[PDB]
Design a protein around this ligand. Structure first.
Ligand SMILES: *c1ccnc(NC(=O)C[C@H](N)C(=O)O)c1
Length: 275
C-alpha cells in the first residue's frame, strides 16, 4: 500500500521508424535508433532483472513511431486503468495493444472515448494523494474531467503547460510526498499553482535541469526506496542533487536518444501494483 509500490511494468519496443517519424518538439539532432534500442533494452533490464518487476514487453509497430511511449496511452491507479485518448490522433491506435495487455493483467478498464476529450498520460502526475493534470497541446479540460470521473476517490486539479511540453517534462515523484521539480521559472510557476490547489504540503527536490526532474520512483519489497534518474554524463548537476537521497537506491539510466523525440524516463513504462 506504500506509495510507489509496483509489481508489474508494461513497456513497448521502439520501431525503426521512430528515428525519422516520431513526433518531436523541435527539429534537432539525428536520432541514433540502434543506440535508442540499446538504451531502451537497459531500461527494461532495470525494471525486470534488477528490480524484479514482471515486465510485459509489447512488440514494436512500424506504423506507430511513438509506440515506445506507453505512459501516454494509459494511467493506472490501484486496480483501475484509464485507457487515454492521445492528443495526437495518429497515436490513438496505440491503445489497442495496451488495452489487451491490461485486460490480461485483470485490471478494470475504463476507456476515454469522448470525441471531444484528449489526454496524454505524460500530462498526469499522481502523487499518491491526488492527481495534477497538465492542460497542454495534447491534454484538454474534457480529458481532465474524465480522469477525475474515473478516479473518484482522488482530487484532480489542472495546471497550464507550455509549448511542446507535457507536465512531466519538468517534474515527477521522487519519493513519498516528494516532488522532483525543475529550476526554470516555468517549472516553478507550475509547481506553485499545484501547491496552491492542493490540501497538502509536498516536499520538493529541486534539480537544475528541468528534463532531469523526470525520474522513476519505486518502492520495492526488501529494497525500499528506489529511483531511476538521468546519468551524470547526461546531466551532471542534476545527478549531484539526486546523490543526496541517501536512503534511496539510486540507478542512473541513460535516455539521451529518446529525449530527442521528447520521451523521458516515466514515459517508457506503465507501472502496476497487483497485490
Ligand atoms: C514523456 C514526457 C514528455 N512527452 C512524452 N511524450 C512524447 O513526447 C510523445 C511524442 N514524441 C510527442 O507528443 O511529441 C513522454
Amino acid at each position: 500500500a506504500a506509495f510507489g509500490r509496483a509489481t508489474h511494468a508494461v513497456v513497448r519496443a521502439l520501431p525503426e521508424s521512430l528515428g525519422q517519424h516520431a513526433l518531436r518538439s523541435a527539429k534537432g539532432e539525428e536520432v541514433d535508433v540502434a543506440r535508442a534500442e540499446r538504451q531502451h533494452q537497459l531500461y527494461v533490464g532495470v525494471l525486470g532483472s534488477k528490480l524484479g518487476l514482471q515486465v510485459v514487453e509489447l512488440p514494436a509497430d512500424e506504423s506507430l513511431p511513438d509506440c515506445v511511449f506507453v505512459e501516454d496511452v494509459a494511467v493506472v491507479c490501484e486496480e483501475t486503468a484509464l485507457i487515454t485518448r492521445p492528443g495526437a490522433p495518429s497515436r490513438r491506435k496505440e491503445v489497442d495493444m495496451m488495452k489487451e495487455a491490461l485486460e490480461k493483467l485483470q485490471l478494470n478498464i475504463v476507456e476515454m472515448k469522448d470525441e471531444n476529450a484528449t489526454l496524454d498520460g505524460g500530462d498526469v502526475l499522481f502523487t499518491g494523494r491526488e492527481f495534477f493534470v497538465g492542460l497542454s497541446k495534447r491534454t484538454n479540460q474534457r480529458g481532465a474531467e474524465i480522469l477525475a470521473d474515473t478516479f473518484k476517490d482522488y482530487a484532480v486539479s489542472t495546471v497550464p503547460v507550455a509549448d511542446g511540453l507535457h507536465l512531466k517534462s519538468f517534474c515527477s515523484m521522487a519519493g513519498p510526498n516528494l516532488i522532483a521539480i525543475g529550476s526554470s521559472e516555468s517549472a516553478q510557476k507550475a509547481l506553485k499553482i499545484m501547491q496552491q490547489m492542493s490540501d497538502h504540503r509536498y516536499d520538493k527536490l529541486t534539480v537544475p535541469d528541468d528534463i532531469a526532474a523526470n525520474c522513476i520512483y519505486l518502492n520495492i519489497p526488501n529494497k525500499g526506496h528506489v529511483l531511476l534518474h538521468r546519468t551524470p554524463e547526461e546531466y551532471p548537476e542534476s545527478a549531484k542533487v539526486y546523490e543526496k537521497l541517501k536512503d534511496h537506491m539510486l540507478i542512473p539510466v541513460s535516455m539521451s536518444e529518446l529525449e530527442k523525440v521528447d520521451g523521458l524516463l516515466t514515459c517508457c513504462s506503465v507501472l502496476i501494483n497487483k497485490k
